[PDB]
Amino acid sequence: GAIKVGAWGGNGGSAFDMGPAYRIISVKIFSGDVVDGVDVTFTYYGKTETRHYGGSGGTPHEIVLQEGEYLVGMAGEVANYTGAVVLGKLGFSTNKKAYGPFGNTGGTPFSLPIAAGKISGFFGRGGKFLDAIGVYLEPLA
Amino acid sequence: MNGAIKVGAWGGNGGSAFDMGPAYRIISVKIFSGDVVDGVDVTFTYYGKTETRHYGGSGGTPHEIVLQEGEYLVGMAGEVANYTGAVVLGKLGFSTNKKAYGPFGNTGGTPFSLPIAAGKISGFFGRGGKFLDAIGVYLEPL
């Protein structure tokens, strides 16, 4: 868990920190006007777990990673929504396809292309919505 | 290769790709800029020898970052701009554990930002032509 980039977003809400997973199985992005939160399902030290960060409003959009598929990009926009500085839009790329945007509120763009390596986990801040998000990076095996 | 983590590049697809790799100790960076980011010099040491590599073009005014003892690059940010029909770095700056430098350049466009919560920049890659078309970084633990 030595390489953490981000977080992008605001200073509100409460901190979360997943740490790195052995393998990410799926990510669900909950969104409506903004990004409400994320589920991450993953393997970890012999266990399989699901963790939820942020709120649970909006609609879930699930990206299931197939055998040999991994996350190689994240991008989005940081927006003001109802006075909260949050992820207004969020998306992800795998080595196969890009997904998103999830959310509808424009703001300040950010983008993280990973030319070598993969996203292995998440940290950030959450409340009613997803205030901020960053990622753990690991090399490819 | 060999466990590298490379993020970026941010910028356009013109010019010629460069890739310094991560093997070297970065001593200083010089960002040449005017309206946009024209180029960069990266000076590094390796086995007691100091070398400078220049990427991008010949224009712009220099803006230097000379890393002090115990000073490491821990952020990069800027703007990707359309300038005279090319997609290039319109602004580029860096942060260390000590100080923020820049950004340098005068043309906005699409912002990017790389806060590094854990880790440091250990090398550069990107694309350079008349201007600095794009830039990315190698990361390692701190």
Ligand code: NA
């Ligand atoms: Na896919």
